[PDB]
Ligand binder design. Structure first.
Ligand SMILES: *[C@@H]1O[C@H](CO)[C@@H](O[C@@H]2O[C@H](CO)[C@@H](O)[C@H](O)[C@H]2NC(C)=O)[C@H](O)[C@H]1NC(C)=O
Ligand SMILES: *[C@@H]1O[C@H](CO)[C@@H](O[C@@H]2O[C@H](CO)[C@@H](O)[C@H](O)[C@H]2NC(C)=O)[C@H](O)[C@H]1NC(C)=O
Ligand SMILES: *[C@@H]1O[C@H](CO)[C@@H](O[C@@H]2O[C@H](CO)[C@@H](O)[C@H](O)[C@H]2NC(C)=O)[C@H](O)[C@H]1NC(C)=O
Ligand code: NAG
Ligand code: NAG
Ligand code: NAG
Ligand code: NAG
Ligand code: NAG
Ligand code: NAG
Lengths: 597, 597, 597
């Protein structure tokens, strides 16, 4: 009896003609995409120039100090100090300071609608040469005359001081550059590019024309060294109510640029995909997307440095590598990418492939740029990855498809041998199978309880000596009480009624046979025992393939410096001060009490 | 003799019963995961409102200027100018400026604990109408009375000036909004929401109640246009020691919000995975993670705009697309993600699938947000990729497993034909193989030196004319001097002793046979020569599969603007100034010398 | 006739000896890389300390106020208020304020080169105790004496006020820490670490030595609480022209550090690849690249906290997990990664694997750090992904290669059965194939028009009763008028001339046969009809594999806060103010008009 019973039994007769089936034809294997045409080239990326136009100048003024003093016995107290900074008149700058490096001990200027005049020491005007300032770590240059305050003499009236001061400083002007400031925190409400030449008079000024002046062929005389006329300039000279500042007038457009060069890309591969271009600098790990057309520097505001810098850089680069390997291809091309980034691009071709497409590339505004260039480095990554995995996986499907094609060539010859099995496998269920011409006549098989099956001890034929069986005989019943059938066993638990599986008696006749969960054994055509597959050392026909799915992962908010670490980086907080300062009175004083008597 | 000897030889007899082996059964192929259920919906993302509460007001004050002058022959010098900014009294604002647009030529205010009174021109009080300020590019509005300083008349006392000034400015208050400032850099130590209505008196104030006032049904009269009563307001009026500022009192909570709307997401797919939710806006390329529960706006501080804005936006969006395709699903849902981001989410369902889960979603504090939203766009990416590669690779393993299943169906029939080979392959080593029942009796093969093997010139049988051999005869010896065996050759360098491979003599009898590194040839059962595989044009049975592993790549530190490019973007550096300014004295003066006589 | 004609026909004779071919040998399957050796360890990452050295001090000064008043009938006006802040002399700080908490009602100090003396109320010196300031929300502590300004008495001279003020404030010094400032916005041009001990005199000072002092064993007496001598200190005392500030002198190097601890990494796997190291904190999702050598803290400037903090942190961590599982491995190791990031790393080994490599790890400068740590989190990601996909795909190629190896074992036995087909498949074109020894004699097949082919109704043999054909007879012609050949049909549209495919007549003889686009049917060896494959329910032999390529995706510029949202976050804009302020005069005054008479 079927000891090992963790299986099902089947009985498969010759499958009646109907039904008949056919194998699926070879499938059309997919094709590798032609790929993606990339254009090798050099690129330069500009950015919204948030940097203020920087230049240098010179301040000329005098620190006037009028002091009143009250004299008492064995003591003295300041009664009211009046400090002011007054301009050094135009002529006093040209004829006095520049030429000789001197300055009047007197100050004459308009203040509060009147011609006030101050005399140092309250003594007749004496011209006094200038001397370098004192200890000044990390400070631009500066000179002056007076070094001591003047106070009234002993008694029981007033004293005026006049220190002609001149300082070299750093000036900072920002778009639209209609005005600028200094390192002293002093505003100057005139465009640094104001003047007369170049129609500079068009530029902005808040002052009367008589205040401003513009000296031509001006030879500055560097004090201290006393050196002079190193270079002639068109010295602009404005006279503020509090001082007189001057600087070398320079052209606007050439000196400024609303954009700043950010990156020099040696190889910026350019490709089209979806009505846009693709610039991927693998060197920097970045990818930009731009419309198909270019961008005229004409619509740009004061972006003169742009074209200038682009050319210089590119030509510079083309001379390091490409000058031998490749060759230029048309005039510079400019495209604008998302995030407000301007891309200067010059295509390249190696002699190996020795254009018209490059042609036909063609108020005022200004460009804004995103402080974050991550969306691009992201795109870059994704694409380079996606593109890869796709281009790769595709190759698989093809080979696979092709494999299944060749495999069929095998299934064809195979079905000839064991249709009953081959077909059963191709139908995913035990079925009777036989070849009816080129197609296959088939009819399902029938399940049989293993508990109802038992084998005969004899593989021999009492009625036919000399000859024996090739397969031991068996008996079974579908139902729990069903009739008993004299059918012989076939491969893989099939119950072949027709007992025509025979073979002449053989010497040294060992043989194992599939029998339920395990096998059955027979020595010399005589039964032996049943066993489990475990006993028989199993060998595999499969090519192993160990795979592991990519695990998850958490990306936590991570920052190098929180904005608060920045609001603190500022050594001085203008808000902290003014708050505490304008709160000073409230803390240490009462502003509501009135007194009288 | 075996000329081509870059190979090994084997002799395979009928493998003795022991040992016997079995093929590995079909393996259980993995199953596709049910997938990931995504919930379609609309979302809105708020952020820590770092923006200061912005509002407008009006300043009212007078620029008082007392000047002392010393008169000399042919000259005159200011002896001490005293400038001050004094408030314009309450009544003077309501009865004078508002109604008629005028202002007194006199200033009466408390300063340093006393009732000082200033008269413009030192002349009896005259009411003077106000006039718009002068040229003012990029400046809010402003008016005034006086336009010239008043100085003492010729001699050899003092002159007071009074310019009633009023300016429209921009006020800025920040959390907790207990106070605010102006564009003039003037602090006002009172909560902008202070007053009486709405229990505003609860709000913060550093001033006595008599200073502050709150006019009801106030009809402002726009100067210049002289238009008036366009709209009535509850004008708040505070009087600082230096001026009198006023503004329309407004409610707090409605006007402010500690959070600001950042992004309107049309489709924010929501899914659960690992006790958290998944909101992936594929449009923006971002993914947020939130706890399973919601977040009550109750724990929020003054976050009233939140719910308001969320509703407006969502309903707005639902009317563009979803209003036809989908339908709302319950009240708005709010979840908090990592990085301090608040997510407003409203689920959606198309009629095709026409909830309780949405239910059961349920001092004071404030939310902080990370300035970097990259950890999210990272997560988003990773997942969308990982999830893909996994979902894909899985499909492979399955198909593969299935392939190996079907493949077995072939290996079964195949072993019947060339067990000696099929098995040798399944054992990874040359072995003798024969079918013992359903299993396979096997016994390893034996290596034989090729240098010891030589073939016989004759494939014919001198003793048996008419008939010949199907395989030429050979001889060999295992050892270097071992006995010589009369065995015939079998397929693939097997040495079948039993010389029973025969065939009747055939006409036009060409035949090639595997012979060491190459082959051996025989014409008409008579030897010819040996050759190498090279000669025979080889054909492949393999389906090619060209693969390439993803190359490495370097991600270099890349920034659009270094923090230093920012510390410079600021036109004015409060630190640069105050340093140079407070260093001014050290550079151009001595503070250690004392004088007397 | 061939009704279904969407196919081609072929005639295949026994392929003449030439030409002959051979199958491709098994290919050498690739090997799994040994992998990547990772070193488990703990790490700590420092960063460019952009934070200013923070410490506390105390200001001591007096608010002197000299006021002149003009008296008139029924009125009075300030004629000129002179406000000044003067220092509280050294002795007055030690003997008066510290001990008793009092201060002189008089101020004696040098101003404008003279010994001015101020008396509160202009009355003989009286010592006045100090009292806490008034209402002060979010302000450090502060005390004072006077609380009211002093003004001249009724008439028709001057009044001086003296408010001894002392404030606790927050001091801020930045590299090189040669000077510092206060919360009052007051600069102090002396290195906070100046003094005498520790050779502090080396530090920077802009003042004469007599101004600065350094009290030893100083016991501060906390006012209000009047508590004293809680702790003795080396009180530094500098006396600026405007005040006298003091603070506890402390060592420099220990108190400061040009680097700040950023992240404590529990597990920072370290590995080598391409002459550099690999530190991947999977916890944070980050990867750093450093040279093979270390970095001496010797080249570091004032980076003392570094080693200190590194040790504390690490040892701390090693006591939470590793103390039991792993064991320390040598002294701390420091490497510098790109982006200016310093990595403190301590390797680890579990007892399971229980070093020399760790050894041999070995003016002044300072480190700069990138504000963006994304290039790293990028690298991290890419690698972890790339490495995965590679390590995975590889496994495929191998298994695949191996599969094709085993597959051959099948192709060998298969070709024996249907060479004509097997070979045709291996040649990618219909060819005649037969086994010539071990190789295969082959010769291409010939295409034949289907329109020229017709089958015979009889599968029977009139001349040979009892026996019949196994394959119906056919006729055809290559050319459009070519000769008619008596060849029988073979499998797959082959035209086997030799009509030797026979079989005895059979009962119930159904049979289908491939016939052009469809099939042909015969009942009892008598023709029936033709049909299309559609009729016959097709069954597949292929293992399906549904794949999908990863779709594209757009990464749009996305920012949490634009830099402009930051330029606004600042409650006060020093530029806005000074612009409007220094523009005040232009708006409400004329600076070009002169008057006289
Ligand atoms: C780059 O890819 C394009 C896109 O396919 C290729 O253009 C194809 O070229 C082949 C012939 O070489 C043909 O299919 C057509 O001429 C093109 N088809 C398409 C779809 O465009 C191109 O050949 C590739 N490489 C280069 C250098 O041109
Ligand atoms: C979404 O995925 C879940 C997770 O499997 C699915 O829920 C399963 O549904 C199937 C029957 O359709 C069964 O396995 C169980 O009902 C669920 N199993 C698990 C593991 O949850 C769900 O069907 C999927 N789709 C939808 C729209 O529900
Ligand atoms: C980590 O990977 C390296 C690199 O291969 C391994 O070193 C190899 O070890 C095997 C023997 O185990 C041999 O190929 C050589 O000794 C090494 N080859 C190379 C290329 O280096 C190492 O074994 C791996 N793991 C450990 C823990 O050592
Ligand atoms: C590019 O052109 C398209 C129209 O083709 C326009 O919609 C889009 O705004 C342009 N992009 C930029 C960056 O200006
Ligand atoms: C082209 O390349 C070479 C590389 O050595 C470079 O030195 C040179 O400047 C370039 N061309 C010439 C001849 O200048
Ligand atoms: C979410 O809830 C968990 C507990 O379930 C808590 O540990 C965690 O802090 C919460 N996250 C946020 C963002 O508050
Ligand atoms: C629904 O969608 C349509 C789209 O045309 C939109 O115009 C409409 O406002 C929505 N519903 C209605 C009827 O308002
Ligand atoms: C690391 O060392 C290499 C030379 O081996 C040098 O070129 C490079 O500048 C160094 N990197 C850093 C971060 O200093
Ligand atoms: C080692 O690990 C344990 C974990 O419980 C920790 O508590 C302990 O501090 C460590 N070692 C010891 C004994 O302190």
């Amino acid at each position: 009896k079927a000891e090992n019973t963790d299986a099902n039994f089947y009985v498969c007769p010759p499958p009646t003609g109907a039904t008949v089936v056919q194998f699926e034809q070879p499938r059309r294997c997919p094709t590798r995409p032609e790929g993606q045409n990339y254009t090798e080239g050099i690129a330069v990326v500009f950015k919204e120039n948030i940097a203020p136009y920087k230049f240098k100048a010179t301040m000329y003024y005098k620190d006037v100090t009028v002091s009143q003093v009250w004299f008492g016995h064995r003591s003295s107290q300041f009664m009211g100090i009046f400090e002011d900074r007054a301009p050094v008149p135009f002529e006093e700058v040209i004829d006095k300071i520049n030429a000789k490096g001197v300055c009047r001990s007197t100050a004459k200027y308009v203040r509060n609608n009147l011609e006030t005049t101050a005399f140092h020491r309250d003594d007749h005007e004496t011209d006094m040469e200038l001397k370098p300032a004192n200890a000044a770590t990390r400070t631009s240059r500066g000179w002056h005359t007076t070094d001591l305050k003047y106070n009234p003499s002993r008694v029981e009236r007033y004293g005026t001081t006049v220190n002609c001061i001149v300082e070299e400083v750093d000036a900072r002007s920002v778009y639209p550059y209609d005005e600028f400031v200094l390192a002293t925190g002093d505003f100057v409400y005139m465009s640094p590019f104001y003047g007369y030449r170049e129609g500079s008079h068009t530029e902005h000024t808040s002052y009367a024309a008589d205040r401003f002046k513009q000296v031509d062929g001006f030879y500055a005389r560097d004090l201290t060294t006393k050196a002079r006329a190193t270079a002639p300039t068109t010295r602009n000279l404005l006279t503020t109510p509090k001082f007189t500042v001057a600087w070398d007038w320079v052209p606007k457009r050439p000196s400024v640029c609303t954009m700043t060069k950010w990156q020099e890309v040696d190889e910026m591969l350019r490709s089209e995909y979806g009505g846009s271009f693709r610039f991927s600098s693998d060197a920097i790990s970045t990818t930009f997307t731009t419309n198909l057309t270019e961008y005229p520097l004409s619509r740009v505001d004061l972006g003169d440095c742009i074209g200038k810098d682009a050319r210089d850089a590119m030509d510079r680069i083309f001379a390091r590598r490409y000058n031998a390997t490749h060759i230029k291809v048309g005039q510079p091309q400019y495209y604008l990418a998302n995030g407000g980034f301007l891309i200067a691009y010059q295509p390249l071709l190696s002699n190996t492939l020795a254009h018209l497409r490059e042609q036909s590339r063609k108020s005022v505004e200004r460009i804004k740029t995103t402080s974050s260039i991550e969306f691009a480095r992201l795109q870059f990554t994704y694409n380079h990855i996606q593109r890869h995995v796709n281009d790769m996986l595709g190759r698989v499907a093809i080979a696979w498809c092709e494999l299944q094609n060749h495999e069929l060539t095998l299934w064809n010859e195979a079905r000839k041998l064991n249709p009953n099995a081959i077909a059963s496998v191709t139908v995913g269920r035990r079925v009777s199978a036989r070849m009816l011409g080129d197609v296959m006549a088939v009819s399902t098989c029938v399940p049989v309880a293993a508990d109802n099956v038992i084998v005969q001890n004899s593989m021999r034929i009492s009625s036919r000596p000399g000859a024996c069986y090739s397969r031991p005989l068996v008996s079974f019943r579908y139902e729990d009480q069903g009739p008993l059938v004299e059918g012989q066993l076939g491969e893989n638990n099939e119950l072949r009624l027709t007992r025509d599986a025979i073979e002449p008696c053989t010497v040294g006749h060992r043989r194992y046979f599939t029998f339920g969960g395990g096998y059955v054994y027979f020595e010399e055509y005589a039964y032996s025992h049943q066993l489990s597959r475990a006993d028989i050392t199993t060998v595999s026909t499969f090519i192993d393939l160990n795979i592991t799915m990519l695990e998850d992962h958490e990306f936590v908010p991570l920052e190098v410096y929180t904005r608060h670490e920045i609001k603190d980086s500022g050594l001085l907080d203008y808000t902290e001060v003014q708050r505490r300062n304008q709160l000073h009175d409230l803390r240490f004083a009462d502003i509501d009490t009135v007194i009288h008597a």
